[PDB]
């Protein structure tokens, strides 16, 4: 099973190191092929093609954060990764102010304010264009409802600011309201991003699946991730019609911690476990995920973000010995 790997920015390379080590100890029949897109210089469109080419062959990737539009938006258009899914789920032993929480955040990832459409309209007055199209709003709405259909979920909530951006956000809501009628066995609710963010802090349990355009997904991804423990533990994945690339849920380089063996690889490991599920290696997927989850519940070895003193390497090997203790 070949898998495209992009180590990415900041502590990205360190996290792939932990995935690579845990995979070896679990005898994961997976062979990573490494490519580099983050922080390149004219070598831009070349490196993007090597990814698309290996993606046509492997159809599945695992990537760190990736530091004309940005390299991230370009990759996501080049691969058509319109849909991004973040599983916001409590880890049983890792206690926060909101335990037993299980949300899905679905964000559109190819338009909105991430388009880099800005220009100086006069000395000191900058204009910036947020883009909403019918085609992409429809597609992310069908994805969310097919997701909640497949995974046995009850409610899908569309988050927006159509009371202010009546045309653009309005058209996002409209496509959501249209699609919702095709899925009558799924509850459909709408909510203004303002309130939704307050709601998620007071009582996030009222939600199930959320779907939203780009910028609101970047906010809610991070807010909700912080509910269940923060960027060290929360995973993510991005889909095309034929591709699936797995990543962290609240994407951050963590420049501070590079070289200090400090970063928590839980998010990247859990993500790698979902990647294995996507590859029909269910036995390996549930083993790695169960080992990650048990080392945290037990409480002996834990990184700084989770109240402990352990290094990233200490925590990683505790996982490896536990997985080897299963084969």
């Amino acid at each position: 099973f070949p898998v495209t790997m992009l180590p990415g920015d900041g502590v990205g390379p360190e996290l792939m190191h932990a995935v690579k080590e845990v995979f070896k100890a679990a005898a994961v029949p997976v062979e990573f092929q490494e490519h580099h897109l983050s922080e390149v210089q004219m070598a831009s469109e070349e490196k993007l093609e090597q990814v698309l080419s290996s993606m046509k062959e492997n159809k599945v990737a695992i990537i760190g954060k990736i530091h004309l539009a940005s390299y991230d938006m370009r990759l996501r258009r080049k691969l058509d990764l319109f849909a991004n899914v973040v599983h916001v789920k409590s880890l049983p032993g890792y206690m926060t102010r909101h335990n037993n929480l299980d949300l899905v955040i679905i964000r559109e990832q190819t338009e909105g304010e991430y388009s880099s459409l800005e220009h100086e309209s006069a000395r000191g007055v900058i204009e910036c264009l947020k883009i909403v199209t019918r085609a992409k709003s429809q597609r992310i709405a069908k994805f969310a409802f097919d997701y909640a259909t497949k995974k046995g979920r009850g409610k899908v909530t569309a988050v927006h600011k159509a009371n202010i951006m009546k045309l653009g956000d309005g058209l996002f809501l409209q496509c959501c309201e249209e699609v919702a009628e095709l899925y009558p066995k799924i509850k459909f609710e709408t909510m203004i991003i303002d309130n939704c963010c307050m709601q998620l802090v007071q009582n996030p349990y009222q939600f199930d699946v959320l779907v939203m355009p780009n910028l609101y997904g970047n906010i809610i991804d991070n807010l909700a991730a912080g509910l269940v423990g923060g960027a060290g533990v929360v995973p993510g994945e991005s889909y095309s019609a034929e591709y699936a690339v797995f990543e962290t849920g609240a994407r951050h380089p963590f420049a501070q911690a590079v070289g200090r063996n400090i970063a928590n690889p839980t998010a990247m490991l859990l993500s790698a476990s979902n990647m294995l599920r996507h590859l029909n290696l269910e036995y390996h997927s549930s083993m790695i995920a169960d080992a990650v989850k048990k080392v945290i519940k037990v409480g002996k070895v834990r990184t700084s973000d989770m109240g402990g003193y352990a290094t990233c390497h200490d925590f990683t090997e505790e996982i490896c010995r536990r997985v080897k203790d299963l084969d």
Binding site: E113, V125, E127, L129, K130, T133, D194, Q199, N218
Partner: protein
């Protein structure tokens, strides 16, 4: 003795306005009220007696309004309300999962994605226009640094997404950076919006004053209100031109309980406290604010929404006898 423009509003508005009136009188506050109605007429604008009142008194207290052109966008243009101040403070003795929260959000109120400017480019393709200007940015940043200097705050954080929106948010950042160089007594730092949201929910005590453009401010102020109990206990003031400022509740009209003596008037009251401090009446503000917090710490008479079942009258009455010290 001074006059304040009072806009009771809709639903619980009258009840909570009257509750604030009774508390002010009990506290012997030197405040008289000019009641006014701002439901819009067209020639769209607010009624002449509303504007004339506000232009003369400068201070206005405004309850929840019904949503139909929004009367709050109208008020904002009519008085150039450019600075939205929203202090977010843990209520001693109203338990949430968060404690010792003390954050002030300074939100640019004129610009950003709130321009009102959108186009249908071709069928099925909309562009919405975010607008960031040099003057609005410098103005809001000068406001956040004056607020920090006048209220013992030590740190101003500028919240932005200049990595995604390089030119507009970048300009906002640059004007914050300039003003910060001009105010060496306030420690200044920069932080991405998503990163703030990621940390605010984990450790809210790392934040002091935060200044940001319109859309970010509208969202993060309400997130932060979740940390301390919701919109029913959160005050809000808007500062504008010609010394005009309007202090307001930001909760809904709550029609499900209008007129049933059940409403929570803490928000409008805490806003009326901001107002009192804005007018120089520091002693009445502190007594009224002290009387309010003490009623809540005591617990024996909270309104339904904060886990009790006292009427709005009983809650209002305990504050009145307390503020007579």
């Amino acid at each position: 003795v001074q006059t304040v423009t009072l806009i009771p509003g809709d639903g619980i508005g009258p009840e909570i306005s009257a509750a604030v009136m009774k508390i002010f009188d009990a506290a012997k506050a030197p405040i008289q009220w000019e009641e006014r109605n701002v439901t819009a007429i067209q020639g769209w604008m607010i009624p002449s007696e509303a504007k004339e009142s506000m232009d003369k008194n400068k201070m206005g207290l405004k309850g929840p309004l019904k949503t139909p052109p929004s009367m709050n966008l109208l008020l904002r243009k009519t008085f150039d309300l450019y600075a939205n101040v929203r202090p977010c403070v843990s209520i001693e003795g109203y338990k949430t999962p968060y404690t010792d929260v003390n954050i002030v959000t300074i939100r640019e109120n004129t610009e950003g994605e709130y321009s009102g400017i959108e186009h249908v480019i071709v069928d099925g393709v909309v562009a919405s226009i975010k607008l960031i200007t040099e003057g609005a940015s410098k103005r809001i940043a000068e406001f956040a640094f004056e607020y920090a200097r006048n209220n013992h705050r030590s740190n101003v954080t500028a919240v932005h997404k200049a990595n995604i929106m390089r030119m507009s948010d970048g300009l906002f950042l640059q004007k914050c950076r300039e003003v910060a160089e001009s105010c060496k007594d306030i420690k200044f730092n920069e932080m991405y919006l998503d990163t703030v949201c990621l940390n605010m929910v984990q450790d809210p005590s790392q934040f002091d004053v935060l200044v940001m453009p319109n859309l970010y401010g509208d969202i993060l102020s309400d997130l932060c209100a979740g940390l301390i109990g919701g919109l029913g206990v959160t005050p809000s003031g808007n500062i504008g031109a010609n010394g005009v400022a309007i202090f307001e509740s930001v909760h809904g009209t709550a029609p499900d309980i209008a007129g049933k003596d059940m409403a929570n008037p803490t928000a409008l009251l805490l806003s009326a406290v901001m107002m009192l401090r804005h007018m120089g009446l520091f002693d009445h503000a502190a007594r009224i604010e002290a009387a309010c917090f003490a009623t809540i710490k005591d617990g024996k008479s909270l309104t339904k929404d904060l886990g009790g079942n006292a009427k709005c009258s009983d809650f209002t009455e305990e504050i009145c006898r307390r503020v007579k010290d």
